[PDB]
Amino acid sequence: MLKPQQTTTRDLISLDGLWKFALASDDNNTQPWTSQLKTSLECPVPASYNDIFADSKIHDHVGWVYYQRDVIVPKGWSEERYLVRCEAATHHGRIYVNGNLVADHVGGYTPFEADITDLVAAGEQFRLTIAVDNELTYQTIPPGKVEILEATGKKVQTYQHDFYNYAGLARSVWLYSVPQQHIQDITVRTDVQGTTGLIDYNVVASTTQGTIQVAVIDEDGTTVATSSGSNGTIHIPSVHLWQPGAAYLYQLHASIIDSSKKTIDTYKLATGIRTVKVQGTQFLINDKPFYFTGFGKHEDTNIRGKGHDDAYMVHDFQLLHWMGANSFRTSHYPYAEEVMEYADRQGIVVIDETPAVGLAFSPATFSPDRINNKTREAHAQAIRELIHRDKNHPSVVMWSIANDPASNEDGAREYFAPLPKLARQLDPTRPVTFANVGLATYKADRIADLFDVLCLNRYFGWYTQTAELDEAEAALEEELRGWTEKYDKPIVMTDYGADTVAGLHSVMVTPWSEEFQVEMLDMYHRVFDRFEAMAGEQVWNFADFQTAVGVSRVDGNKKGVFTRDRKPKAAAHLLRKRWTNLH
Amino acid sequence: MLKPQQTTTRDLISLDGLWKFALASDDNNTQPWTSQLKTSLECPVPASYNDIFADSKIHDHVGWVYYQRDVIVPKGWSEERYLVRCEAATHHGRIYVNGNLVADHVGGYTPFEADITDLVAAGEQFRLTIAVDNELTYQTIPPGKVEILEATGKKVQTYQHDFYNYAGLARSVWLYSVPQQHIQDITVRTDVQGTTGLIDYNVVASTTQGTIQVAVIDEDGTTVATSSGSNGTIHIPSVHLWQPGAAYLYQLHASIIDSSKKTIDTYKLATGIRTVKVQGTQFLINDKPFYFTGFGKHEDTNIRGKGHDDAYMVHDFQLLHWMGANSFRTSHYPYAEEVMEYADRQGIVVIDETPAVGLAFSPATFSPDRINNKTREAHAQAIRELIHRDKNHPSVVMWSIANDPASNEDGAREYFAPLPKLARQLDPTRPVTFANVGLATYKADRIADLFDVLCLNRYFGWYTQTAELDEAEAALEEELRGWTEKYDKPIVMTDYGADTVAGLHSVMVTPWSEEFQVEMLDMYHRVFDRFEAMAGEQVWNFADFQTAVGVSRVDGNKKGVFTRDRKPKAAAHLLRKRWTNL
């Protein structure tokens, strides 16, 4: 269902706060959810739990953890229908109402919920336990594999992606109410004919006794159009288009109306009128060529892990405007819905990506004992959920299906082939892409032709022709010449960068140094501007972020242009100079 | 005497190395130079001793220390005269040969020596003890005062300058030989008539029996002119000039010649043909206007303190060339002589400066109980020794008499007046300056008219309390207007910058961030470029350096554009942008 909001017809209670917290264990208490949890530990919920507690055992935990609290359903909600919703449980969430399992969800970055109307009476209190599991298998979306250290028996988690496997309730939890007859879903699609804007809409509602009205209201509160029925086409004269760098949002009120013209349900959906098209080598937004500038990001801050944070969100966006970035990519998982809403209002463009990173063991990655058909089922599910959630965001301009898959290997094409089609079939308003790793050159990649736009991640300066910038220039150039001569598509660079410790400086060519970072980004730009087919450049990464432990990671990933606490490295000023002095 | 060298007639022995080291104490060994020091400590000799031992007592020590080692005079110096020289002992040095005092010297940054010819015989070993004192008084030229912490009894050294009071033998020590008849000094003075270069020379030699010859050899080895006599004028047709862009150096060989045609003594002095001139607000090198770019520096590196270091010197000059900096000032004491030679070869320009910093207690600074005429003598003495040693360097383009005196107070003009006259008199070929502090505004200062070029130190602190850039800008411009209306002289900004920790970053305007330092330098430049009379900009400082302890000092002074270990802050790149262009 739609992201819940408070209306004249719907109530919404935040369940964020401190919750009682416990790890699972091998105790005579298998089944925590059946009674009041016994812990002195409280974990705040919009948070990953790993770094909260300054305890190694919680942090390194593999398997289930339990959050618990008492909740009271408002007495004035009799005659209504109500649900508990998790915006996200990373990676596998279960919801329990007093000992009853009521939901079981498997991906780590999308919503789920349970209708508890008939299980708990209005004005009743109940014990809400949400179990969350972090275990990654070859069938989970980021895939991974649990192993056991030989000498100690410590359970340990392997995976093939960078960012740390933060787990828990990294996004908000909610109790909300909906009327018996309610709106369940809305799809809006937006074209333009000359200066007239056209909204294709479809409303899905629980019942049909009494009907659907729609109103489109501009930023001034003026109703600009109306329509009747659960689906149709709304004409808007002299539309205020939604543009990169100049958002405009209309406000689409779907109501349910009874036999009298009395309102039964209402829901307010923000929509931007905008078109995306790929014509040969150009990426077009409202029939105007567009060039991405900005970053791959991560949901990651000093203590709350992947926990959504309003201050860092508003600030991060403020830093984007400051340096003239116009976009970012939801690198390696869908971000919080509230970030997409904020991008819509800020006029920021978004490459929206599924959690499907780490489909690469470089042993054959696409075989029965690795990424296999059941894995592809999970991947298809992730695509559906993401698209289902973010279909109405004008900011979201393209779906990224995966990140660094081993798209050079036998079996990779048979694995991915259905996936671009599924996305295009669920949402025909946007192009589909994926982010290509260096192994999969223009020669070796065997997947690229099934996508509408090509995204490349490349580290010539850092990882291969190390500190040898001229050597990296030549190989970068060759490569790009290969892609441009082989495909007639837009090419957006989505990773390029270098680990850089703030404060570390050198007059020489010195990796990890602030000067080196600048020298490399600067060179990459020089090469980009030589190629007409480039449609975007997004630096890796916006900010330093935590990764799994490893001798080649200095307390995480330091390829940020800002520090974890958002202080600018020299590179940040270079991009600022570049992106504000060119379109 | 002249900086010693190896010639065909002269031998030179380095005495650098590890020496035995002891602090003074109050036991019956009241005279350590009268016998072998049995201490187990060894201190390296081109170095300050303070951070070397990882020991508090030694670092914080106030008073004398003793260095010691044996030396052997070579067998073949029989017919020869021989000396022990310290390039520098900071601040007060004594040389002992086996229980006998043979030299006592007071300034901390210039050389001294002793003729030991008659005390020790060729082929003899002797015990060399060198006592060095670190105490400052109101009469030492950087002045200070020793005090006692009442609760602990601890002896403590107060002073008014920034940089830490490092002591010891910060510079090399030598045993050397010279014939009985020898050259003792040479003065060269260079000038231009059309395209022909002129060299006035004067040679001072220990005896006048048998004459003096001079040859002037070019960079290709060609003798290009000669002269006879102890003094004269040599003409160099179509001279290649020494320029800031591009050093060219002639090599002048002064000799003493016996009745026959036989060389008895010889000495090789590098000379660059160049003029310096002030005209109105313009500083002219070889008749064309010059704009100083670069730094205030310090002799400061991580362990050895003020000890001279060939590596850091070459690198520091590469970094200057890297950022297109064309000059620096020897803030705030003469630097190693080798730096001045190296500056000559590198084509870099030098404001050469005395130890006279800290003549300011902001109680009346210039008065009989504070900085007085006895102090002025040490100061005159300091000018004398600096000019005598650096007079022949083409890189040295101006003398700086003092840094941050209280030039706004009563007594200040009467104290200073003799000093620039003295400098111009010992060297009439260069202009004289001093670095003026923020208190001495164009109104308040009462000394400035006695100098040829005005050097201002104007940290933004003087102008704004709360690190507000627009406030700083309005006040700097007002002040510079005052100076340009009231004096017809070149103005060089000799201190400007911001304390800055490497790695501290902010998208806001925040002091102590790399961004703030950048923005402040940049705003200062915009202001300087609005004024025709500006002849120069030297940022304070080149690199981070150690200071006395202050809660306002973060393990030293962090105004460096480089870190102590020579890493660039963002400010270095900003300066590189400006100086490599215009």
Ligand SMILES: CC1(C)[C@@H](O[C@H]2O[C@H](C(=O)O)[C@@H](O)[C@H](O)[C@H]2O)CC[C@]2(C)[C@H]3C(=O)C=C4[C@@H]5C[C@@](C)(C(=O)O)CC[C@]5(C)CC[C@@]4(C)[C@]3(C)CC[C@@H]12
């Ligand atoms: C690590 C990834 C998947 C890729 O994405 C990463 O970006 C950042 C990072 O590298 O730290 C982080 O955001 C995070 O860790 C990841 O998202 C970056 C590129 C990547 C490291 C590849 C390379 O950089 C280069 C490789 C070369 C190329 C190869 C095969 C060739 O084509 O000739 C020669 C050998 C080698 C080392 C093979 C591995 C890759 C393709 C590598 C390391 C794979 C992983 C990539």
